Design a protein around this ligand. Structure first.
Ligand code: CL
Ligand code: CL
Lengths: 935, 944
């Protein structure tokens, strides 16, 4: 059985050298592949195994030389498969790619950081191999920038990093597949431990094989496109995985780094340096499956999960807390708490004596936690309770109070060191996660509020709020918000939508405030959009209303935004309600859909500038919320510089970022990866506050203004002006199939009869990411760089200066370069050859030419001769995914030809040992998991 | 001025000079912990207190080095001059330091590397963990003995090792202080990882100090002398600690070794290679706090704990079990289970779909486990439930069936590798721990059954069951078991004791059979003692009666025992009821109390031989139960040879041994220690079954018979014939205080005969004298050397080639290492009348004489010449124990004698004096005595 010998050779040929000396990646991939193929042979036979192996080898050869004959060989083998074999080949390559991801994670987590590889400037911050850890970030602040330790500590207390978890654009993988990937991960890790006994290594190998098989033999589809509750259950797995234990870990690391620059204090245990907000169950923009009851469900479920974890933590806390010396205050509370009726610790002690006061108060807290979970479960499954809300914790201060009393008492008696053990960790978990783990954001279009108000104004015989000018709207809204009479009653004609909006507000009002983050207005354009939501919030009896966050999507909206926000601050009611804090959302991906990526990038930098001017004029603490698609939305290293790149004083101690679904596994599945994520967000925010990026030279801004004009011209002329574009888009791309399939819970368009305009941004990016072409990400960059080079050769020297010294520009170009690394025009041409009308082929040929030109221009701007010349580790990792993703591409393209065209009969082969829709879904989820994030 | 660290480094390095390997980091560990502890002591009670404590430790270490009595005089001088507050803090301090020494010991043993080049090639290698045979090396069977692997596999399938957890003779330390000891051990371990970053090392250092202080600031007294339920709760900590996870780990390792000798199968998941029995809540011998309700309590509690652990484990199982292809039988069972109402996993899935059949059956099992815990908690807390018995698992096969269905189904579809993961671990845990984790044994005196039958015969006007000869008793008991009429009713004059015995039988009758192991008759002497218990079991309507196990204590009982068992097998009713299985219990410590240690050891070897003869004559599978005090009761390595030492065919695939309380932490607190415990028990059993120790040469037998006669004579002449022995014992030893304080129960059942064996051993272990273990050996070896110049060469032959004799001598040698006559003399000087002084003097001479004689027999010039690692660890504990001894002796003089005024010193710094307010003796003297007792106890661990 010497077949294992071949795959080592093809792997070593795919990535030639070693990117370090702990570079064990090719070994890891070879081992996983060998064990997996042995499993495939043992489950489906020697013939199936030989076919799959020949396919992988061919794919490796293609990713080597990019010879199209290799692709035709792949096609020949794949078409000759009846759907039965097609499912097994597609499934198999999916799992193989997943294993490659696992090895990637292990390599990254245990790679040794090389201190002699730092150059000393900001470029070091674009890779995990050279980024500044927390303590290096401190020394930089204290050395170069002359900031005192006191100032660093004070800045830290007041800083908040808020990570927002979003429902996966496709597969938010089963809560069980995290677990299996974990076991494979850990087995791989220990097999290479330089301290392993032979029998331990044997049992580890058997566990590895057993779990690879365990993953290959579970189905990946069926049932419902899981209900929002199910997808939310999946999203919360990472709290069990790493974050719950990981947060006190990281915060204690902050304590140590502080001591090493002379600060004796710890970060206060009630300071919110870390926060988690979620969209799962709250985003309704173009997603009707998210009902008011869905939101109530994910809220109560969240409070349940939190109560369980606090409950199980407090028992180890209770064993720890066996001291007897205590405060007079704590002694009082213990003798008081002793006056009551101890059922949840009979296995531990018959009862708790008053000679163990901490155990008394903590056992009471354990009881209240129990009653909290039971009440939440009752309301979720029934609608009423019987658990008195007074027998539970209903707000965070009731919970923090006894714990803080313990900490005070322990410190009084000279027992602070015990306090900084399990007790401090526990307080830090309470303050970070609260009673809900996450705080749900709500999102809805502005137009739906227009509808609700139009029915309100029609029912009151005032006219139609939709016909009114923006100023008439503003005036009416102001008068009502200033007044004291309610607005409407049960007597109100409600369409299903209008009832949906009002009912959403009612459920928000029926739940504790600590469950909710922000109310987000999609397609916001004018101050009346924010005022609308504020009034609807008030007249629906929301006691403590949510902060309203406008989301400026289109480009014109972005130009009009700073006037709009200034106008909002100049109105007394909004100024008095916000309390000196205002949050605005920008959608890098959305704006990109409107006007191409380059113009959306430069416009967002400028718009953030003007917003900060306004927020300083009127004295509010502005917080920019970064939607899906940005530079700060990438995985790992690059985030560190993306954050540092943002315009000065747009962060101001409060960073709110979306952790895209495609990146969350890579960023939180493993102890080390999670630590370094929390670390680089915390450290980068802190540095950017005291060391803002350079301000751009005027010639740079003038140049980018030109390039923005040309780029939007090209992008809009191709995507919107070309009359035969959308026909091509529906042929050369699986957009229609994605819309009809059970992949995402969302409809792809806002009006089924509309063009590219009504198509949502997420399907736009996905459709072209499946074909390894990525047109939405780079289109426009070509004609911009071309235009300025022809106007004068010396502008290329200016662009290269910009790439070398202006962080913003470097991170924009870098993202593009990375997306090109995941691109292959050859595969796009194969989709063309099978799926596109012959008279439409030159269209594709021309666009691919545009591709190659833009790539050449991007490489020249970054001063590179190869893509990702600066990040060879990332280059290696992606080149290794390429070999599986390509097979999933060819399979997808022929499956499309077969699905769309029942007139394409193929000479099948005999079925291969112990249906086209399922194969297509597999190739989609696979390529999706392989390409991860682009734009 | 913090160069006190140089002082403790120098004293430590003098205490243990060399290296016993090169991964020998023990003195490093001890210095590091001690330094952090002393700094904490200074920051809590002041610089002066810290300097006092450090000076005391240095003096103690210098003493354990050169044994100069001046050092003892210095320690005493400082200790008498402390007011009770400072005496409490000094005593507590040294207790905690000794504990830290034990933790460092455990880490060093767990990570010491076994040296393959150090094996000598014979059985002596089996007396230390550093050279013993692992599972696979016990390959030995295949080489030397030419046994086929198939025969080894069959032997292993049928082998059962039954470890019995017993209540601690003193402090089975709070489930809370064990935990802190765990955090300290782990912190120590990770500080020495060769890949740890500087920030990691800083945070680990602070975590260690934090937990040392946290342990120092917990009280070690107060509350109740814990109820038997509390002691049982504490005893069950080790299942959560290591054993629950440890059993599937060990069994899988067995699987690997079997693969490594060519066997393709695994050990069947339902074969009981490991079992755990318990006495906590069932031994009532001289312990009236153990009531019927106590037994009902610990039974129900155990079933609760088991249900909780299965419940939490089965959720990881449910996530794992996401397969879809399955057996036809399993698909059926899944569709069947789908017809019902999914509450215990709303956080995981809204409900479980039928395309995940395994998850369906497993979710049902999770439901049934939940209801089992709730019903047990209800019965314990009320007396009734409302949980239908049909919704819980009441016997183990109900539980096993659906899991086995999953395993079968998974194997059907070629998913055996998935089956051999979390599912196999779960099946193995089910089979090993069952629904109770442990099985409770019950124990009671024979005389207490005699009372019950005597009141019965008096109530029926037949005579007094007490007056009847052993054969008249036998006769009546036989006719009654043959009969069909019940024996008694509510109309029966019951003393309080008799009500206790009958009520215990009724409670046994009310509980499931999986809860109970064996009924053990203390002071068994004759078959009528067993027949009484069988008859009481039947007439109290115990549906499935317990197996009855006689415990033959005294020497004459041991000679008479095989006659009794032969007569018992020769009775038709008993022969058919036992079903070919008989378990007999020996108490190495009890027999030791009767006739000296040597005579009890040899007599126990011979009596086991004769019992094997009887069991073959009548075809019964005999099972010997080793009570406390044995060679097989030691910690770690030595156990391996002790088991191998047993007489041929006395084990026969069924080993039952007592895990003494003082040893349990050393054997089960840490992952590796647990693995090697289970491994040496399993491997020793398997090997001894197929490779019996050599049979003894006839001259060795005759020689040991002689020595036993002399030794018993000396021992009894001192302990029972000297009229002033009992007077001395109450002066030179804290026996009266041990009984009068709060530890244990009742020591007397009169003189030393009515004194229980455990307080007998304890009293003389506190004063580092150990008279019960060695008394008699001196005069025996002296007698045989004078009888003939050559007998010493024969004894040395025995020590080198007869495993039994080697392990007896070896245990003695270890006990002497924990001995020090100087300290005993100090106890004399402070506590014993002057006209009694020569008595102790003469006794001490025997000690020294016996020591020299043991040394010559073992071919040694120093104690423990063969086990320098153990010598090092003991040498190191002794430096704390000695200070605790002096403190104890002066505290005794102060307690017994209110006319002993001492020039006290000014109180040091901030109090512990006021945690015992209702004390009849001085403010801090009671607690100080208790502290020294618990301390010295934890320092000397096991002797005899
Ligand atoms: Cl109880
Ligand atoms: Cl639900």
């Amino acid at each position: 059985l010497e077949k294992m010998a071949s795959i080592d050779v093809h792997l070593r040929q795919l990535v030639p050298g070693k990117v370090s000396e702990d570079d064990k990646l090719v070994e890891y991939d070879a081992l996983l592949l060998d064990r997996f193929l042995d499993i495939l042979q043992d489950l489906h036979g020697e013939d199936l195994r030989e076919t799959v192996q020949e396919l992988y080898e061919h794919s490796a050869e293609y990713e080597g030389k990019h010879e199209p004959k290799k692709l035709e060989e792949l096609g020949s083998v794949l078409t000759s498969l009846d759907p039965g074999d097609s499912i097994v080949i597609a499934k198999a390559f999916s799992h193989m790619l997943n294993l490659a991801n696992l090895a990637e994670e292990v390599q990254i987590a245990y790679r040794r950081r090389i201190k002699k590889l730092k150059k000393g400037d900001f470029v070091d911050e674009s890779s995990a191999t050279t980024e500044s850890d927390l303590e290096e970030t401190f020394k930089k602040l204290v050395g170069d920038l002359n900031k005192s330790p006191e100032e660093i500590f004070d800045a830290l207390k007041n800083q908040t990093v808020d990570l927002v978890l979003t429902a996966h654009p496709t597969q938010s993988v089963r809560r069980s597949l995290l677990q299996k990937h974990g076991r494979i991960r850990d087995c791989l890790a220990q097999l290479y431990a330089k301290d392993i006994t032979p029998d331990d290594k044997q049992e580890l190998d058997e566990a590895l094989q057993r779990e690879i098989q365990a993953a290959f033999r579970t189905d990946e589809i069926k049932r419902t496109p899981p209900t929002p509750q199910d997808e939310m259950r999946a999203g919360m797995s990472y709290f069990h995985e790493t974050i719950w234990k990981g947060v006190p870990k990281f915060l204690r690391r902050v304590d140590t780094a502080l001591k090493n620059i002379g600060i004796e204090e710890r970060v206060p245990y009630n300071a919110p340096l870390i926060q988690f907000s979620s969209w799962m169950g709250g985003d309704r923009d173009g997603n009707p499956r998210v009902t008011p009851e869905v939101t109530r469900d994910v809220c109560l479920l969240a409070r349940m999960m939190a109560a369980t974890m606090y409950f199980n933590q407090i028992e180890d806390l209770m064993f720890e807390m066996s001291m007897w010396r205590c405060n007079d205050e704590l002694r009082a509370r213990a003798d008081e708490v002793h006056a009551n009726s101890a059922k949840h610790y009979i296995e531990f002690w018959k009862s708790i004596p008053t000679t163990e006061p901490y155990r008394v108060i903590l056992g009471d807290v354990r009881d209240k936690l129990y009653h909290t979970r039971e009440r939440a479960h009752q309301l979720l499954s029934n609608g009423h309770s019987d658990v008195p809300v007074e027998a539970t914790f209903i707000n965070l201060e009731q919970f923090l109070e006894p714990l803080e009393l313990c900490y005070r008492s322990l410190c009084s008696c000279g027992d602070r060191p015990i306090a900084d053990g399990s007790l401090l960790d526990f307080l830090r978990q309470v303050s970070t996660f609260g009673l809900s783990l996450v705080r749900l954001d709500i999102r809805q279009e502005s137009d739906r509020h227009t509808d609700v108000l139009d029915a309100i104004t029609t029912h009151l015989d005032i006219g139609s709020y939709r016909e009114w000018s923006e100023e008439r709207r503003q005036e009416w809204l102001l008068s009502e918000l200033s007044g004291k009479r309610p607005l409407f009653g049960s007597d109100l004609p409600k369409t299903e939508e209008i009832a949906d909006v009002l009912d959403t507000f009612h459920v928000i009002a029926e739940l504790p405030a600590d469950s909710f983050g922000a109310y987000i207005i999609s397609m916001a354009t004018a101050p009346s959009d924010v005022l609308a939501v504020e009034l609807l919030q008030r007249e629906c009896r929301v006691k403590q209303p949510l902060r309203v966050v406008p989301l400026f999507e289109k480009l014109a909206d972005l130009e009009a935004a700073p006037a709009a926000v200034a106008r909002l601050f100049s109105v007394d009611w909004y100024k008095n309600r916000i309390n000196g804090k205002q949050e605005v959302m920008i959608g890098y991906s959305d704006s990109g859909k409107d006007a191409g990526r380059l113009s959306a990038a430069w416009q967002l930098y400028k718009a953030q500038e003007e917003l900060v001017k306004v927020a300083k004029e009127y004295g509010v603490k502005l917080t920019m919320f970064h939607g899906r698609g940005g530079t700060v939305g990438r995985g790992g290293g690059p985030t560190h510089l993306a954050i540092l790149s943002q315009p000065p004083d747009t962060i101001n101690g409060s960073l709110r970022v979306t952790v895209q679904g495609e990146v969350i596994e890579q960023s939180f599945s493993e102890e080390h990866l999670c630590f370094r994520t929390l670390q680089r967000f915390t450290a980068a925010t802190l540095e950017h506050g005291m060391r803002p990026p350079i301000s751009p030279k005027p010639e740079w801004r003038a140049l980018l203004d030109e390039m923005a004009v040309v780029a939007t011209e090209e992008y809009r002329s191709v995507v919107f002006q070309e009359p035969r574009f959308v026909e091509y888009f529906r042929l050369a791309t699986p957009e229609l199939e994605y819309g009809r399939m059970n992949i995402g819970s969302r409809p792809s368009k806002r009006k089924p009869s509309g063009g590219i305009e009504s198509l949502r941004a997420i399907p736009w990016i996905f459709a072209w990411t499946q074909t390894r072409f990525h047109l939405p990400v780079w289109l426009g960059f070509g004609s911009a760089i071309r235009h300025v080079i022809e106007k004068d050769v010396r502008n290329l020297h200016m662009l290269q200066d910009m790439y070398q010294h202006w962080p913003f520009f470097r991170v924009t170009i870098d993202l593009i370069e990375m997306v090109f690394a995941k691109g292959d025009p050859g595969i796009a041409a194969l989709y063309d050859k099978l799926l596109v009308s012959e008279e439409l082929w030159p269209f594709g040929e021309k666009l691919r030419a545009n591709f190659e030109e833009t790539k050449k221009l991007i490489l020249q701007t970054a001063g590179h001769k190869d893509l990702l010349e600066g990040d060879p580790y990332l280059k290696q990792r992606l080149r290794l995914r390429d070999s599986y993703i390509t097979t999933l591409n060819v399979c997808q393209a022929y499956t499309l030809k077969r699905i769309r065209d029942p007139s394409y009969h193929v000479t099948l082969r005999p079925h291969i040992s112990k249906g086209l829709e399922d194969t297509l879904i597999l190739t989609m989820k696979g390529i999706a998991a392989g390409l991860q994030n682009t734009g």
